Design a protein around this ligand. Structure first.
Ligand SMILES: Nc1ccn([C@@H]2O[C@H](COP(=O)(O)O)[C@@H](O)[C@H]2O)c(=O)n1
Length: 299
């Protein structure tokens, strides 16, 4: 379920976002959407904490001791929420200035950056063979994702600067969260709550600084339609399900699993719905399979 959710969210999110940034008459503030995602992800996570603890007495006790009463953990988790506030704003900026396929292939440069950050920050080791598989995975998804390289005027060079920042944020913020998540027995849903508390403050401050002038003229929830709330739900679910992947695997295996699921989803579409496929897909799919094989070998 959590692999078929991640693909159908991955498919739906970037297309629905790209649509809502280009086609609107009354256009919404992207900074607010990033902030509202952190609010919803907090409220779902608070819900999940009650379900995990499985008791009102245990839930309340967890909020006191672990959520609100672990200040140094909130201090640590304020760092990646500041970086994710950058990242997610750069993602709305990138999809406003570049094509959906162009964003997709370019943003996979996070996979090398995330692998480097994993080796740097978590003090792990990747062999020469494992490094070969990471770049081969990156080249494999490039071949699978490839598509030709809006009703509004755009700026590609500003769009690529945004993906350059967002790629660096993806590696740093994700691995920082993994570092803090796996440093104790504290629950995933506490760590998410601890993070999204600071996130809501940082993202709301971002909105003030970026769009506060224009928001006074128009309103905070200006341009919001049924499709903007759809995008934010997908961003919230995706955000939560990403933290679950990092919990049960790691920030490198997030990339391999994401790539493997794109190939499995396209193969499911060929068999069930008679989808026509390219030779680039066939070659790229094999590279994704070899990369998983090479990464999955003992040294
Ligand atoms: N603990 C975490 C870790 C990541 N996330 C979200 O998951 C996304 C990570 O995207 P990447 O996998 O592209 O780095 C970000 O939008 C981030 O806000 C989250 O909501 N909670």
């Amino acid at each position: 379920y959590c692999l078929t959710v991640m693909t159908l969210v991955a498919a739906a999110y970037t297309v629905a976002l790209r649509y809502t940034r280009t086609t609107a008459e009354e256009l919404y503030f992207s900074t607010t959407a990033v902030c509202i995602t952190e609010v919803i992800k907090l409220l779902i996570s608070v819900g999940l904490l009650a379900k995990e603890t499985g008791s009102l007495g245990r839930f309340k006790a967890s909020l006191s001791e672990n959520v609100l009463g672990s200040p140094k953990e909130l201090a640590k988790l304020s760092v990646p929420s500041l970086v994710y506030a950058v990242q997610n704003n750069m993602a709305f900026l990138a999809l406003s200035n570049l094509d959906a396929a162009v964003y997709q292939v370019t943003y996979q440069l996070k996979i090398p950056c995330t692998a480097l950050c994993t080796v740097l920050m978590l003090n792990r080791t990747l062999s020469k063979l494992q490094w070969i598989s990471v770049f081969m995975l990156c080249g494999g998804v490039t071949l699978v994702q490839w598509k030709p390289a809006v009703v509004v005027a755009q700026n590609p060079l500003l769009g690529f600067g945004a993906i350059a920042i967002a790629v660096l944020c993806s590696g740093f913020a994700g691995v920082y969260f993994e570092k803090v998540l796996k440093s104790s027995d504290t629950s995933l849903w506490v760590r998410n709550i601890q993070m999204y508390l600071s996130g809501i403050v940082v993202t709301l401050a971002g909105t003030y600084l970026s769009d506060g002038a224009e928001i006074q003229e128009k309103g905070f929830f200006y341009g919001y339609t049924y499709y903007v709330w759809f995008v934010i739900f997908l961003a919230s679910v995706g955000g939560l399900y990403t933290s679950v992947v990092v919990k049960y695997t790691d920030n490198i295996m997030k990339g391999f699993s994401a790539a493997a699921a794109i190939v499995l989803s396209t193969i499911a579409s060929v068999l069930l719905f008679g989808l026509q496929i390219t030779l680039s897909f066939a070659l790229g799919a094999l590279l994704v399979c070899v990369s998983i094989y090479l990464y999955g070998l003992p040294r």
